[PDB]
Scaffold this active site. Structure first.
Site, PDB file in Angstrom:
ATOM      1  N   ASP A 137       0.873  -1.165   0.000  1.00  0.00           N
ATOM      2  CA  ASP A 137       0.000   0.000   0.000  1.00  0.00           C
ATOM      3  C   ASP A 137       0.910   1.215   0.000  1.00  0.00           C
ATOM      4  O   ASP A 137       1.865   1.255   0.775  1.00  0.00           O
ATOM      5  CB  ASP A 137      -0.917   0.005   1.230  1.00  0.00           C
TER       6      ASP A 137
ATOM      7  N   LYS B 261     -16.637  15.683   2.139  1.00  0.00           N
ATOM      8  CA  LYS B 261     -15.416  15.904   1.360  1.00  0.00           C
ATOM      9  C   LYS B 261     -14.826  17.300   1.521  1.00  0.00           C
ATOM     10  O   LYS B 261     -13.815  17.595   0.873  1.00  0.00           O
ATOM     11  CB  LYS B 261     -15.608  15.601  -0.134  1.00  0.00           C
TER      12      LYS B 261
ATOM     13  N   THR C 238      -2.990  17.818  -3.402  1.00  0.00           N
ATOM     14  CA  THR C 238      -3.494  19.148  -3.730  1.00  0.00           C
ATOM     15  C   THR C 238      -4.719  19.454  -2.877  1.00  0.00           C
ATOM     16  O   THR C 238      -5.799  18.897  -3.098  1.00  0.00           O
ATOM     17  CB  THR C 238      -3.822  19.243  -5.218  1.00  0.00           C
TER      18      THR C 238
ATOM     19  N   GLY D 120      -4.150   3.646  -3.033  1.00  0.00           N
ATOM     20  CA  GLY D 120      -5.400   4.378  -2.954  1.00  0.00           C
ATOM     21  C   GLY D 120      -5.270   5.758  -3.567  1.00  0.00           C
ATOM     22  O   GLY D 120      -5.731   6.754  -3.005  1.00  0.00           O
TER      23      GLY D 120
ATOM     24  N   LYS E 131      -8.742  -4.809  -3.251  1.00  0.00           N
ATOM     25  CA  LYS E 131      -7.396  -5.204  -2.855  1.00  0.00           C
ATOM     26  C   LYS E 131      -7.342  -6.680  -2.502  1.00  0.00           C
ATOM     27  O   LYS E 131      -6.428  -7.395  -2.924  1.00  0.00           O
ATOM     28  CB  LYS E 131      -6.917  -4.373  -1.666  1.00  0.00           C
TER      29      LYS E 131
ATOM     30  N   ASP F  95      -6.511  -2.707   4.173  1.00  0.00           N
ATOM     31  CA  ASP F  95      -5.958  -3.925   3.594  1.00  0.00           C
ATOM     32  C   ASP F  95      -5.744  -5.009   4.646  1.00  0.00           C
ATOM     33  O   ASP F  95      -4.850  -5.849   4.503  1.00  0.00           O
ATOM     34  CB  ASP F  95      -4.657  -3.649   2.844  1.00  0.00           C
TER      35      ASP F  95
HETATM   36 MG   LIG Z   1      -1.944   2.153   4.086  1.00  0.00          MG
END
Ligand SMILES: [Mg+2]
Ligand SMILES: *[C@@H]1O[C@H](CO)[C@@H](O[C@@H]2O[C@H](CO)[C@@H](O[C@@H]3O[C@H](CO)[C@@H](O)[C@H](O)[C@@H]3O)[C@H](O)[C@H]2NC(C)=O)[C@H](O)[C@H]1NC(C)=O
Ligand SMILES: *[C@@H]1O[C@H](CO)[C@@H](O[C@@H]2O[C@H](CO)[C@@H](O)[C@H](O)[C@H]2NC(C)=O)[C@H](O)[C@H]1NC(C)=O
Ligand SMILES: *[C@@H]1O[C@H](CO[C@@H]2O[C@H](CO)[C@@H](O)[C@H](O)[C@H]2NC(C)=O)[C@@H](O)[C@H](O)[C@H]1NC(C)=O
Lengths: 1135, 362
Positions: free
Chosen positions: A375, A545, A608, A688, A808, A832
């Site tokens: 990851d 968000k 960003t 991700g 995953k 994960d």
């Molecule tokens: Mg991680």
């Protein structure tokens, strides 16, 4: 519901509903007695059941299935056995002040104690707290086996429940308990105690939530002890029921080991009905000497169909050598996993945390890995966010050079031409400061040379520069906590690492912030405490968000109330879309190139983030918050109104600037990935992240170096159809044609017969960056996943970006299933944990604020730079050791226990032994079962500083060459050879059968031949382990000599004792005789000579890589490397 | 804190000599084995060719013999000396009588006259061979009782059913007494009487004594001790009935402290043929010439087509003579030499050079 009473002695024969044991719960003790009936029935004294040819499906089946897994488990019955008794105490039994309960002793593990748990004691069950010694019950829950988090959440017993504390106030409660049953849950429980007082003497409630229910799988830290009744049982504790989803059955060896045991029985049942057909041709002869001097029946049928009480005295003895094997590898794997734990170079010195093995079972399966799944955020990047860059109204001054090394792929500038340019600019930041209390030792901030004379003072660009600069430190989620070591320094904890990256930098930017209190937030002026405050908070969420706040801005002029404004920040999904046409900051020559200055930040690989501002109305400033108390904060926060009110009035949005967030790598990751990918391990990065800042780091940590195909998926559709019309739809045809084009551009190998496979490292270097929504449409159905595999199988290191946390675990099941290949999954995080459990070895990075991927892991390395020290040193040792001692265990039993059969042809298969009754016992216990433990533990084929330097020695593990079944059938034939040497060499001394003694008296008993046979078998297969191991040394060379003279010193002690019948002097009769010592030096030779020749023929003319390295290692190619060496470290030279 | 105890063992930094199989540590290890196990293969066959034996089989001496002296048909004797390679003065039988005093299947003193032209030098051993008497079956060799051997008492159940060794067929008759040497070993004992001296015949008539004292080990009487009970309720086993026709009196109790030809029979021989020592002479030398001994036949061997016999020898340090243990050194020496001159016939012309690590530099 559920029933638990108090202060009962818990009888056994009662049925009454006052009883606690009448619920009939199981224990935590989840065999040995079956082993005893084997050894007693085996050859001698107490034969319980020897029926003959009817137990032949009874004994061979139990030991391979029911007794293998009982010995295999090293944490379900070993960590359950050594935990007892967990501080049994003496304040027990006799007790006085009546109305005081006399204390009892029920069992070892039971429900109904007041037994404490001190520091470092594994708690026997789930407990609810009653009393402690600290104030407000200052204790917590720990998260080492079943619970998962890092922080120390304080948990209280009720303030009158903590009235009883002393050993004078110990037996002073009584109440019955409502509970629940098996649910396979972790954080859900219901209950309520209407408990009895101490002070008042009345009955009173106590509400129960989950947080007072601490668990069995715990080990307490940082506090001394606590008290409680053992409330909940141990047998319903769900850690063994939740973890693991796999039974961690081991690998390609210990799942193919039990087929190797059956070949031992099958090639030994053949030599029992060759004995059977040769003992029936003996009864029907009647000219032999079995009738005159022997008194029996004139027939066969000793027990049934011949002398079968001998034949099933060997099968029931040869069913002890697979039982000895399973005990032999669960001392090796417990030791090969106890030298990973005791290694100083797998130690996280920043955190004081060694590589702790969370599975003592598997270490061999490290040595044959060829897929590493990782990851990006957490496991090969540093996973602390820090603030580097920002744009302010057009100007974005200074560039902290970190990741323009792959945007400028063709050359790196860190040598002198770009680092020392900006290192001198970093010295230009730190050699002077305009404001004091800037920490300047851990800053690494947004560096600020000068704007207007180093202090910044009509310049409206600066007027809204420090507006947002303080605002990212004024209003944010976390609160500035204090450092207990020094009050001048302020530490910052967070669950969102980007948000504490802003606040920790803005203190070091200037106007040094110290105190964020609900009393207020100060700004220094005049020497008086000028101090600000916020009203409320607006939470950043992944369903939202974005983030705003509710801040207090005062009315600073008398006779007037001025106007305030509110903050907005987050990700750039809807930020650029709402245009600005009415405010003072419009879409102009500034706003689009600063968006380009935020478009440029992703091209150099930064997180960003943006910052923006809000419009309102003046008279609606009170109306904007008068509906929030009833519709937003009261009940409907988690419901969908907070997004609706954040879209209603703000139909257009005012954008000013942006903040750049950058993530370092962990230490030594671009060296470790360079180290592991040349060892033969195709490693896949499951991230991700989007494309151009996961392929940006893909050249930074050098898994991509030369080849990557330019892919334009350019789709926006889905696939609701499955039956027909494949060229009619856009997205499903185009990505699948992309698979076959980049087949047919690189080779026409679209293929349906999957049964071809090499584990060889691929020749042409390739790399795939598949785009998350493509693999969802590629792992979906049949015959598209196999087009995905052999594309990805033909690559060095693919990348999979924007991968869902369920996808995953699906792509690691794809390679593990559709190929025969075990995989590795390294992790840190709850996204994960399904990937860790899926792969056959799950490594886990520990020490952070998230550790659900640590106690669910398989190993617990500190940094990623230890992975190439765990796999390439402690892993390939655990496969060159253990794929060698496993056929060194099915060799040394048939060097010995096949001469029982070769003295069948000189006995007419009638059933006399050839050994003592203690040379059958003490052979596989003391004589030769000791050094095959130490070839399993002390066999470094090459040194610790040599397998790192030459990592390609790990390619023995992938290709499965140190372990196959054909290696095994040339070590059973090596025992079948050396069981005609260890027998017929003491037979042909006696074959004309003279005296064999210097003193002429002679010695020809059955047992005085099995001292000639055992003692030239124990020596001729202790040297065979000494000759075959690499790295002879001081500890394993010592205990391979003290197993060569236990055979000479167990004769000389047991035979000289009068309790051994037929024996008083088999020491002096045998060892002081020159005929023993003249055949002891021939059958030691003839047992080693057909293999020390083959080990010299093979190691001269068709050698393996593991002697070519260790003969360069004595010419001195590897002299200059120091001891205690690892290339994957910055603080040491690499030479 | 929890830095994990760096001690050059847990990091596995044990001092270690690291052997490498080159043709620098192997050819001085095959040549040193090939030159030892030939000069030991010559030193042993030097010792084991001077060993002289005399082997005479007498199992057919009741039937195929005469009252006068008749030569043995030479499928019943062989013997070899180191001064006389070819030697063909055959020995001769003499079967005296069927004396008709409770005559059995096989009886009558076979008297063998042999001829030795050399000297069994200092210790002279008189063994007896027994071919085709399989004395190693499952029930045979597990049938005695250690309480009676060590001399102590016995119940009925101490000797009938015991772990391992038990007198399971032979602990009581119809009368139900305790047999004193119970078990199929001691019941079926070799009871051919041997003379205590080899008579000198033809030349001198100065005899050659052969005691049966010290016929097995001195440290062996601590488990073959005298009996503890002197009872009339014990009686000989059902094959010793010719030797004790009326049971044990107060006088004829067998002291197995020193009845030493029985201590040899209580170790059952482990193979086809069986040689147990029965007459020794640690005093004198055996002068050459010709002798004669008188074996009184009592052991009915002929029904299972077996054999009895004589093994008169002088033992080496390596025991008796056996061509194996010397010839297997020169097989163990002339194979490791032949596998020393094949692994250099190939090494000089295959010829690997110690190089870079191959298959990863390909
Ligand atoms: Mg991680
Ligand atoms: C010791 O020498 C004797 C010779 O007298 C060996 O022969 C065994 O002698 C007994 C006593 O006569 C025999 O028992 C009798 O057998 C006849 C059948 O021939 C039977 O009708 C009688 O009722 C009585 O049972 C015995 O059979 C005979 N042995 C054999 C194999 O026939 C004796 O074996 C020697 N003992 C040793 C070596 O311990
Ligand atoms: C008990 O029996 C034994 C033999 O079974 C007797 O011993 C014999 O005694 C006579 C007496 O002169 C001797 O001639 C024999 O040589 C003895 N036998 C042996 C083998 O030497 C013994 O005498 C008997 N007991 C009594 C009291 O008469
Ligand atoms: C030495 O041997 C002689 C042998 O002479 C005959 O031996 C038989 C039986 O041994 C005997 O019955 C005869 O009487 C002997 N004499 C004659 C003339 O036939 C024996 O005398 C003794 O066994 C021994 N004698 C001495 C003195 O050692």
């Amino acid at each position: 519901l559920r029933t638990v009473y108090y202060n009962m002695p818990l009888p056994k024969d009662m049925i009454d509903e006052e009883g606690n044991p009448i619920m009939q719960y199981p224990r935590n003790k989840i065999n040995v007695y079956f082993l005893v009936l084997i050894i007693l029935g085996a050859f001698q004294i107490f034969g319980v059941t020897n029926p003959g040819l009817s137990a032949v499906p009874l004994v061979v089946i139990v030991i391979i299935t029911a007794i293998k897994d009982a010995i295999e488990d090293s944490r379900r019955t070993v960590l359950d056995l050594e935990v007892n008794n967990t501080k049994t105490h003496i304040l027990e039994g006799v007790e006085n002040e009546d109305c005081k309960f006399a204390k009892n002793y029920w069992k070892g593990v039971k429900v109904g104690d007041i037994v404490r748990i001190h520091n470092n004691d594994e708690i026997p069950a789930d407990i609810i707290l009653l009393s402690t010694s600290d104030t407000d019950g200052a204790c917590y829950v720990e998260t080492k086996n079943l619970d998962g988090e890092t922080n120390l959440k304080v948990r209280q017993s009720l303030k009158c429940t903590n009235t009883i504390r002393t050993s004078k106030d110990i037996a002073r409660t009584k109440f019955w308990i409502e509970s629940e049953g098996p649910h396979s849950n972790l954080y859900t429980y219901q209950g309520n105690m209407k408990w009895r007082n101490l002070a008042d003497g009345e009955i009173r409630n106590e509400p129960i939530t989950i947080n007072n229910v601490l668990l069995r799988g715990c080990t307490l830290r940082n506090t001394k002890w606590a008290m409680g009744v053992v409330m909940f049982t141990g047998g319903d504790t769900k850690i063994m029921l939740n973890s693991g989803i796999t039974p961690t059955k081991k690998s390609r060896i210990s799942r193919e080991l039990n087929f190797s045991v059956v070949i031992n029985f099958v090639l030994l049942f053949i030599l029992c009905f060759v004995s059977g057909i040769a003992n029936g041709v003996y009864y029907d002869k009647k000219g032999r000497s079995r009738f005159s001097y022997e008194f029996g029946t004139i027939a066969g049928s000793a027990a049934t169909n011949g002398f079968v009480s001998f034949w099933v005295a060997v099968i029931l003895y040869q069913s002890l050598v697979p039982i000895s094997l399973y005990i032999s590898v669960e001392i090796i794997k417990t030791a090969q996993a106890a030298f990973i734990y005791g290694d100083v170079l797998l130690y996280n010195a920043k955190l004081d945390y060694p590589c702790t093995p969370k599975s003592w079972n598997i270490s061999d399966d490290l040595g044959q890995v060829e897929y590493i799944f990782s990851d990006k955020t957490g496991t090969l990047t540093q996973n602390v966010m820090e603030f580097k860059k920002c744009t302010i109204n057009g100007v974005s001054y200074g560039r902290a050079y970190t990741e323009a090394l792959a945007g400028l792929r063709k050359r790196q500038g860190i040598d002198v031409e770009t680092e020392g340019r900006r290192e001198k600019a970093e010295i230009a930041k730190d050699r002077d400061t305009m404001i004091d209390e800037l920490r300047a030792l851990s800053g690494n901030s947004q560096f600020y040379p000068e704007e207007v004379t180093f202090v910044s003072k009509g310049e409206v660009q600066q007027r809204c520069c420090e507006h947002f600069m303080l605002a990212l430190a004024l209003c944010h989620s976390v609160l500035v906590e204090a450092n207990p070591d020094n009050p001048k320094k302020l530490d910052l904890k967070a669950q969102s690492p980007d948000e504490a990256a802003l606040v920790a930098t803005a203190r070091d930017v200037g106007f040094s912030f110290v105190g964020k209190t609900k009393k207020g937030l100060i700004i220094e002026m005049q020497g008086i405490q000028k101090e600000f405050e916020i009203l409320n908070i607006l939470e950043f969420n992944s369903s939202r968000k974005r983030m705003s706040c509710i801040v207090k801005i005062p009315g600073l002029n008398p006779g007037d109330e001025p106007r305030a404004l509110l903050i907005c920040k987050g990700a750039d999904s809807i930020i650029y879309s709402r245009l600005s046409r009415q405010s003072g900051s419009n879409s102009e020559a500034i706003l689009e190139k600063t968006a380009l200055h935020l478009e440029q930040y992703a091209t150099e690989g930064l997180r960003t983030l943006c910052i923006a501002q809000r419009e309102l109305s003046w008279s609606e400033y009170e109306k904007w918050n008068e509906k929030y108390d009833i519709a937003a904060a009261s009940l409907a926060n988690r419901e969908d109104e907070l997004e609706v009110v954040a879209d209603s009035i703000e139909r257009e949005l005012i954008l000013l600037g942006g903040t750049a967030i950058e993530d370092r790598l962990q230490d030594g990751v671009p060296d470790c990935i360079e180290l592991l990918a040349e060892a033969g391990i195709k490693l896949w990065v499951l991230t991700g992240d989007k494309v151009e800042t996961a392929i940006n780091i893909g050249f930074s940590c050098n898994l991509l170096n030369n080849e990557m195909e330019l892919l334009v998926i350019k789709t926006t559709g889905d696939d609701v159809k499955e039956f027909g019309s494949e060229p009619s739809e856009i997205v499903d045809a185009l990505l699948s044609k992309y698979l076959k084009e980049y087949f047919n551009l690189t080779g026409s190998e679209e293929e349906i017969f999957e049964a071809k496979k090499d584990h060889e490292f691929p020749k042409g270097n390739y790399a795939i960056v598949i785009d998350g929504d493509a693999l969802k449409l590629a792992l979906y159905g049949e015959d598209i996943r196999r087009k995905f595999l052999l594309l990805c199988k033909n690559c060095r290191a693919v990348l999979c970006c924007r991968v869902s946390p369920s996808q995953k675990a699906a792509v690691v099941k794809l390679v593990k299933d559709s190929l025969d290949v075990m995989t590795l999954a390294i992790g840190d995080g709850s996204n994960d944990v399904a990937m860790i459990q899926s792969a056959d070895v799950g490594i886990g990075i520990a020490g952070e604020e998230g550790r659900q991927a640590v106690m669910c892991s398989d190993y617990a390395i500190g940094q990623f730079r230890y992975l190439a020290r765990l796999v390439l040193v402690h892993g390939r040792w655990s496969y060159k050791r253990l794929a060698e001692m496993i056929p060194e265990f099915f060799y040394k039993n048939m060097i010995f226990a096949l001469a029982l059969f070769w003295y069948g042809i000189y006995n007419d298969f009638d059933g006399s032994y050839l050994y003592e009754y203690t040379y059958m016992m003490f052979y596989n216990l003391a004589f030769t079962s000791l050094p095959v433990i130490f070839l399993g533990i002390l066999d470094q084929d090459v040194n610790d500083t040599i397998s790192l330097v030459v990592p390609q020695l790990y390619r023995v593990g992938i290709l499965r060459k140190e372990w196959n079944q054909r290696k095994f059938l040339w070590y059973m034939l090596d025992g079948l050879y050396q069981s005609i040497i260890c027998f017929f060499f003491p037979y042909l001394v006696y074959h004309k059968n003279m005296i064999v003694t210097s003193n002429g008296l002679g010695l020809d008993h059955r047992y005085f031949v099995g001292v000639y046979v055992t003692t030239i078998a124990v020596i001729s297969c202790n040297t065979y382990v000494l000759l075959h191991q690499y790295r002879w040394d001081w500890f394993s060379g010592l205990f391979i000599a003290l197993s060569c003279l236990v055979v000479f010193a167990w004769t000389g002690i047991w035979s000289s004792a009068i309790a051994s019948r037929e024996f008083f002097k088999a020491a002096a009769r045998i060892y002081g005789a020159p005929s023993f010592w003249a055949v002891f030096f021939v059958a030691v030779l003839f047992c080693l000579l057909p293999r020390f020749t083959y080990d010299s023929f093979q190691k001269f003319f068709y050698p393996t890589d593991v002697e070519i390295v260790r003969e360069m290692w004595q010419h001195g190619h590897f002299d200059h490397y120091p001891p205690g060496y690892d290339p994957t470290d910055p603080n040491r030279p690499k030479v | 804190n929890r830095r994990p105890k760096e001690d050059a063992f847990t990091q596995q930094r044990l001092a270690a000599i690291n052997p490498v199989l080159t043709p620098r540590t192997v050819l001085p290890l095959y040549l040193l084995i090939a030159v030892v196990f030939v000069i030991v293969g010559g030193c042993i066959l030097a010792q084991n060719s001077k060993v002289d034996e005399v082997t005479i089989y007498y199992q057919d001496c009741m039937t195929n013999a005469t009252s006068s002296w008749s030569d043995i048909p030479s499928e019943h004797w062989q013997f070899v000396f180191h001064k006389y390679k070819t030697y063909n003065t055959a020995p001769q039988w003499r079967f005296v009588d069927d004396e008709s005093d409770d005559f059995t299947k096989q009886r009558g003193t076979c008297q063998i006259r042999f001829t030795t032209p050399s000297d069994m030098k200092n210790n002279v051993y008189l063994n007896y061979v027994l071919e085709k008497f399989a004395a190693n079956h499952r029930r045979y060799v597990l049938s005695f009782s250690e309480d009676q051997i060590r001399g102590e008492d016995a119940s009925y159940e101490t000797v009938h059913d015991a772990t391992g060794i038990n007198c399971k067929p032979l602990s009581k008759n119809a009368d139900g007494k305790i047999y004193y040497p119970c078990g199929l070993i001691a019941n079926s004992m070799f009871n051919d009487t041997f003379p205590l001296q080899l008579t000198n015949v033809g030349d001198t008539s100065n005899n050659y004594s052969l005691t049966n004292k010290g016929i097995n080990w001195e440290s062996d009487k601590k488990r073959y001790k005298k009996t503890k009970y002197n009872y009339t309720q014990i009686a000989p086993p059902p094959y010793w009935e010719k030797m004790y026709p009326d049971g044990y009196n107060e006088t004829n109790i067998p002291d197995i402290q020193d009845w030493e030809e029985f201590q040899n029979w209580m170790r059952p021989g482990a193979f086809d043929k069986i040689t147990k020592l029965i007459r020794i002479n640690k005093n004198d030398t055996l002068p050459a010439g010709e002798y004669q001994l008188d074996i009184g036949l009592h052991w009915p061997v002929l029904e299972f087509n077996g054999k009895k016999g004589i093994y008169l020898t002088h033992g080496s340090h390596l025991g008796g003579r056996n061509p194996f243990l010397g010839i297997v050194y020169l097989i163990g020496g002339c194979i490791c030499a032949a596998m020393a001159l094949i692994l250099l016939t190939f090494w000089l012309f295959g010829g690997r050079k110690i190089a870079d690590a191959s298959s990863l530099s390909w």
